[model samples]
Target: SDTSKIKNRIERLRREYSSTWHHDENHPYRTWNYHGSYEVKPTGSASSLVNGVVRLLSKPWDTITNVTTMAMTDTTPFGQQRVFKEKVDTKAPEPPEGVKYVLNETTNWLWAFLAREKRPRMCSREEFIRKVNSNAEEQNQWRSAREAVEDPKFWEMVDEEREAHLRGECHTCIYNMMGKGSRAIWFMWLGARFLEFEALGFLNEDHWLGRKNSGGGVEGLGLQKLGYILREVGTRPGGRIYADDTAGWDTRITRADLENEAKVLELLDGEHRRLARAIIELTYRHKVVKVMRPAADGRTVMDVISREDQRGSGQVVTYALNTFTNLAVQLVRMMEGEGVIGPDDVEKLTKGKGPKVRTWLSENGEERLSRMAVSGDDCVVKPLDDRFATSLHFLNAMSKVRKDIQEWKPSTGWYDWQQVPFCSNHFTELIMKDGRTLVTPCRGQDELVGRARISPGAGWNVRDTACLAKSYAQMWLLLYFHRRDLRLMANAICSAVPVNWVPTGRTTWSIHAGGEWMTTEDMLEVWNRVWIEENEWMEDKTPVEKWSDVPYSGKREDIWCGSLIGTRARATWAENIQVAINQVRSIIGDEKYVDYMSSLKRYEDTTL
Candidate 1:
């Protein structure tokens, strides 16, 4: 009995405020332990029996003692005579500490999920209550207005009431309106971000490196897993992992929620670190590697770090020669010159007409730096930690850079990535300047059209306007090309018959369907094989079937296969290309309504 109590006390210590040593690795908040018998106290006749049983079972069974449920309740308590009311507290039961129990997950799953399910707006129950109350008050205010009940504002109030009701938010509850669908939606983003990071090759290295898989910290490991911005916000014992900074506080969260979030972030991938560094730039100092040189003396050299020198006016400092850091800076500068930063972000990065770079200043009363605009000559950035600056900033700058680089002359060209609308789930292509080209992911295939932009006096091609309704339809055909399957595709490619190019200005003339084994047919087979192996397909018929007639043209052709003539693949192809055509029209804003530009839609929608 003493030993049992001792074990219980030790277990208590393992769970108490001071220790998390026994916490389960898989379960972030629980400890590995032998579950004890239920502590439920029995009443009436069962009470005496239970007490006696506890005494009997407290010690190990000897040769004379046997343990069995049989006849135990019946024979125990010296054969009890009376049945009384079960001794439950007659008073109302207390709610479990805090909040309603909507869903219960183990601490680790909660932590893991929360870590990746990062929403910047994690709020407390108190905060959500405030929001709901605000809505209610606003509704009252609207209702109190002159002829408000008859006004359109009444519907606005109605919408708010319904929104608040659906949100089901409560001030006393710790969580927000996290319905199953809500969680699922957030998880999808987290999952996508995880795949993106992993696909781009930052997952494992951030998790396991330099040491035996300890390098990955919260941001790294979580980014590899899902990516949650870590926080120090909960009051309970275990670490609290937050998801939505605006909404995610739910119920009572214990402190042992996650391991060292800061340490975990400390060991994240370089890109993550740069992100951290960039954000840090908004509020903190980052030591960057810079070279100090006086005048244009390439022969002179001083290798000390730049920021360390206390001198106010000695040498104009810059980064040294073409090391990797210099290269990254050069790369960023090049991209910057081309206005190839994030396209959507160009508005914030450019001046009235100049492509400006933003720099930071610390001396002013500025408390924080927001992602706001800065002019070209006024663009001043705080020096970053030189060690980390070049490694990832270059890549981040490129990926997020705008495509509106140089000024648009008649020949000024820039292209951007556009996802095939209907097929956005799995298909995307690099769109280029001319509009019809299956261009590269960046900058595009056109060479130095910029030089032409520079020398506009040379000449302008009038034929560019002739491409008005010259719509070309292209489909993304990404079949799995295993070495073993490549030959199948090769033969399938050969099965297509070449069609003569027509001078109708529509570049739609290409390959036509051939005999038994065409490209789509081969594609269908390969596609079916993949889905079949994965058991994703439930039936014999494929979503995109092999063509039964001649390759899709304005007119139907004869069926070659089974009586079930199908256009599954062709239909999918049509849907995707149509979406692309609409997208191109949208990009060609000024020309979109023109009769010539309208012609492209026909080529996309037509059978061909």
Candidate 2:
């Protein structure tokens, strides 16, 4: 009779199971990893003694009972705690200081999920626009710039400049036409030297002879001539013949003029120093090399070679050196055309003792540069420091999360408020396919009294819509606001290892690191904070029927307003696990207070 009663209860639970329980394989609790059991033990000494005595007295009966139970019951590990059978009823912890839980209708579900309770209402298009206006405006500026880059004119200009370089023309005049002409020239001069050093094996040799010749040697000569002219003009004020001021000045070079030149040189020196430091770090210190490969889908995939991979590292270094020497020969030709340097100077610069360097630069210089710059999948080497490396990891994780959210076609339905029709009438009327008329919320109303007329049984109900919104909001919040936290957590894990220790694999050592600074509880707190902030507009009790009626914060909107699937998906399962952990931590904690976190670690290990 007791078994029959238990069977009846199971039937009721099966009937009430949501569609998600059947459809969503990716649901957190749906996996075998979360299904674990703890042995039941007698609590008190007296109870243990009594149970032992009872077992000894009725050994045959107990044996028979155990056999029967085993035969009849489902003893699978998965069946032990089916559908999170233990109902937890606990209050959520109070919000942090200065943070108020404003989404009352949404939060109420956490406290009690009454069967008759209505779902939280979706915000109207007008209200949504009003709330997100500033962020939309900001992103509009970014989108415009992105559009410009995609424009044909932009690429045409790039093509024109490349053609000009081939035709022995200096594109520096174009930079002058733009603002900051003087600084542009200085940057180009410094950048040329930077490339020159990269082409030489300066870092690999661990010597400054190449740097000295490329940087100080030519500059020293130019500065020497300029300094002599300034001194001659300053000391002998009227000794020079008078000429037109436009051609050559007869007046003495003033202290102000000298001071201005000094200031400009000082500024250029600072920038040159920065470029030098960057070159050293990229080539020598951090020790990561980037390479490109063609994918099966006819697209390019950029991947990194670890420092430990000697062969790959050497290949990248050789590629960089060859690229530099090729560009150097082109520059020499350009300078010769401008009459800045002679044929002998060109010979001295391009002449190299090494076989590969001499041949790569001299014979095939133009073709090599053209192939490498345009079509060849050559290497671009840079050593990523800890801060930048962690940022990359964090962004990789966020992209995975966004991909998961985008691909999730919830069995419940699609509930996009943007797709919802706007009604200007006092009471919105909907005509159903079966000759049924429905009256719903209208311009001045805050409640929906009837169902919207969409595809038959295709659109989401209010409850499912709210669920979707919460998920979408969580993704937006994490990506826009919690990037710093994610990066910090990644750095905390990876920073312990040596900076040069880059592992050779698809995954980074940072993903392998088990230790993280932010705990599951900490991430849950962050999620809760952001959830509350996004729903802060719900705090005002007044009904907002129009865009003008919505409250204004005077501050810019902080929500991310661009497309959700903007980032490329290059995340591995390790990064996916990190995001899933954060999602489960927040979702489970918010629904009810439960101690299932012990299973979370097991889930992570299993998933990885």
Candidate 3:
């Protein structure tokens, strides 16, 4: 009955605080930048244009051959910890006519132990405040904004705005980047969740305190395909929940930890309580618990991972993977054409070269790697049973050839090759045999084609709720950074950009008439112009230009521009359009620009 009451209460709040508008057609910028806030944008709207430009600009294109490359860096995930000790050839060749190349060359790779901060679950208002209060640095920033506003009543206004936001009446239409509407959105979402948890008896005894769901959706689950996950993590039988003698969960839990956790679970109020506590306190301990620290003045709690780490690792890897997969597939096609390595050859090499590699490993006192994928093609040991056994031969054969790809590797005798990581995704690297350490235009992605089939849409979801949220968060940062740069520049001009011009409404940005109109596209364009101006001031010095100079003054690679990637991409996109414009700029100005822009429209699209 208590649970029933809680459920009913949550249901009531859900409808009471529902969104007033699903979307506003007149103000399309909100959907452009804060797309995670709403469902799909209907076809052929300004949102579509903004989205199209973002996606288009996000990619690196070779209009010469129509070769397209996605935005990505060639850095390792492990932060430069060299897994294999092969020397890097700075002299990698120029990418071929149709090949895409990675632009970055990194050095001084250092490993560091970074501490992630703890996030508190909000089951009630007190808990929510407790979490925010504990997050001093971030909370201080919020409070600091309250202090800086010329209006001493600005805080009250914003508070009122938040309430309005809850009613879906407010819209911060200037730069939603500066708006707290998302915070309001989440607050309501969490409040609604609070009642749901209460119904589930989560709040009956402070039982839900300091905990929350930490699911990332079943690790490698297939949603549209239903529960088909990757291979179940190897575990023992006898699911005593803690039977390390039997636990089969993905994470490695020692018997001692499990035993300790079991004892802790029994301290709960009931079976339901125990199970809930076990999931939170035991299984999801990593998410629920925080490694808290005292504030600088020791007056408050400080969370180490609050500011940026709280943001996800990011879905930026998609482009990087795309480049690699595309290149790999292309390389396979070339190999197939050259009659260099056949599928049968792949099989022969898999078995023929195994025993010796195995024997060598055994001689060197190794178990042929029970856990790791077989490391090499030694041509000496019997091939072990492997899913890759079917095609290892072709991969081995193709990997050794150094086809002349002058565009990819301009230097003669500088051939590209692959090094595969077992049981990995796009987990291969391209090596140059003997090329200069110069920057080539495009970095190839499918450098490991034989090792794994190309899946451009690998691990992709355009409309998943969590994904959309992440999209919104990422988009927020992009707009925030863009706005920050704009402000930095504006401060130099007379009547610097006024705050009121950027109105914060309930659910959208409210740039009232004559308040200086700037759409997402406009902001993006301006950001690019600023970047070009900055670069020109430094002497037409593109990052690539700087990279070519001996003893480069900037980074060993070039200007990562770090967070400026968003701006740089947008700016570069603008430049690309500018090039088209300059070509046609000599003709009918507005008409030519319109035609050029019209040509860039993406009319043909597919979802699957």
Candidate 4:
């Protein structure tokens, strides 16, 4: 009955406070920089006398607005004018003729099926506050404005704007209204209440707090609402949330942190909540360590580790497996062409032997193949499964005349090769016959220290060709068993937070990297084209004609490091990956897929 009462109260609030202007055109308040005067038109004699008295009382308030406008205009340009002046001149280049098939019917259809309209036309009040708080100049401006205006009057302005915002009358810029400080106080109170409700289990798992749901759906808020509330009220007057500045509270929450939190919440709230809670308490709550890594400049960076790193490892394994599979499939095709292996043998190898080989690896060979538990001192073991015996025999024959399919290119330079090293802690050492040891250079001293030390005088002995083939087969088999889990983890991370893009311009007409306005469909088209190009370069060694191409209208930045990958591009990539994984599930059959999904659900139940 208590829960029912709480639900009823929340429902009533939702109905009472929620905005009715679903479409942008229906909303009255559009622009941030309003220069017009607030008029009070009193028609009757008694009303006019009262209005005159009210106007006299509000004269100081009107003067503050006029002076604030003058100062803002003098120092910082008007919002729309500034936007137009600083337009980023970047554009995605054309895809090469060789890779034209990448934008084929299937890809287009996939994009259509997967597309969701999520980008906001204007930044929310919360987002605008974050932007202002993050910037020193903006923070000072707000502080100055606060000092000039009385606290009571400032809050009254904020309350007026907030009510108007909720009513869908207008989206007033709090900065222009001199209400940033007062609004922040309100956010703090709201945040405190939210946390208290959460602690007491008064808030539902799917409770929506804000009047406007940017999601444009009935799906209630969860983790994202928590994120927004935390971000809104956590930072101080001149502090950044993620920065290591000591003056304010340090809540250096990263994207990985958010993703992990989402996964935990999902697991805890699902069917296996009790077990999930226990596991989370044992594993994350008690045993979790702050993973540190050396930055490029040799300084240690904390919180640089995540389970998502393991998911990335899984991706590497998948790519390697696909590469080997394609090679093996081509080899088989060649054998068929030469009349060495018939259609029967081909069918046996693919349909019959492939699944059998995978099954054997899953049941009997995982321990042998997995190096996760092994140290550098431990010698690599070969899997001698009888099921793989025929495959090895074929591999041995193929190995005799084997050549590198494509010329090895550096991972960097002109083209984008989506290759990553096997592990951050491991490197290859080639011990030549001449006794000279060639070791792969470590990125940093931290990496060198983290690497497991090898035994003295372990040299490469080129003996059995079958041994190498078996080693490759074992890795492929291991990945085959692990890919489902890896994919599921990656999907969970990608799906945890919805794709949100940074809105630029007076309205959301253009995104961060300035170009023509984009709908969800337009964004998807850009993503499909670029995705194909990247894959072609990675798989087929197709010369990339458009390394600068992005899903948004901008030159591609170093997405790996300190580059501005447009918000839309980033969102598009995440959506496409989700789509791609779903397609993989379709081919692999849903038995293992459903098992992995259920496992994820189990994890989800733990966090609730």
lDDT of all the models against the reference? Answer: 0.21, 0.23, 0.22, 0.23
Best by TM-score: 3
Would you estimate the TM-scores of all the predictions?
0.17, 0.14, 0.23, 0.17
User: How close to the true structure is residue 221 of candidate 1, measured as C-alpha lDDT?
Assistant: 17
Residue 126 of model 2, lDDT score: 34
lDDT of 2 by residue, 1-608 (tens): 11221232223223433221122232233211221111222111111111111112112223333322322322222232232334222222222211111111111221121112322122232332332232121112333333433445543543443343333332311111101122332333222222323332232232111212221111111111222222222232112111111111111112222122122112223433333333322222223322222223343322222221011123323332322222232222222323333333322423332343333334533332221110011111111111211122111111111112232221111122211221121212223233332222222111110010001111223222222222222222222222221222222222222222221111101011111112222333443342223223224223223212212111111112111111222123223433433443343233332222233323221111
Encode model 4's per-residue lDDT on 1-608: one tens digit a residue: 11221232233223422442011221112222111111112211111011111112112222333322322221111232334345322221222221111112112222222122221122233433443333212112334433423345544554553443333222222111111323543332222222212221211122111112111111122211222222222221221111001111011212222223223233233323433332222222221112222223333222111121111111111222222222222223222323333334421333334443333323532222221111111111112211211322222222211122221211111111111121221122323233332222112221111111111011122111112212221221111111221222322322221222121111111011112212212222433343233222223333324212211111221222212133443334323444444543343233332222333443321111
Prediction-by-prediction clash tally:
43, 0, 54, 13
Error of 2 at 19 (Å): 66
For candidate 1, write residues 421-453 as lDDT tens digits: 110011122222222211111111011111111
Q: How much is 42 displaced in model 1, in angstroms?
A: 85
In candidate 2 the C-alpha lDDT for residue 505 amounts to: 11
Tell me which of candidates 2 and 3 scores higher on TM-score. Answer: 3
lDDT of 3 by residue, 1-608 (tens): 11221232223323533342122232212211211122211121111011121222223322312122222212221211122123222322222211111010000000000001222132443443443333221111433333323233443444443343333232211111111223443333233222223222222223211111111111111111111111111111211110001111111222222222223223335434433342332112212111112222322221111110011110111111121222232223223323333454332333353343323322421221111111011011111222222222222232322223222221111011111111221111112122212111111222111111111111232122112122222222222222221122111110111212221111111110111112223333433343233322223423322101212112211122121223444346433544433332332123212232332222211111
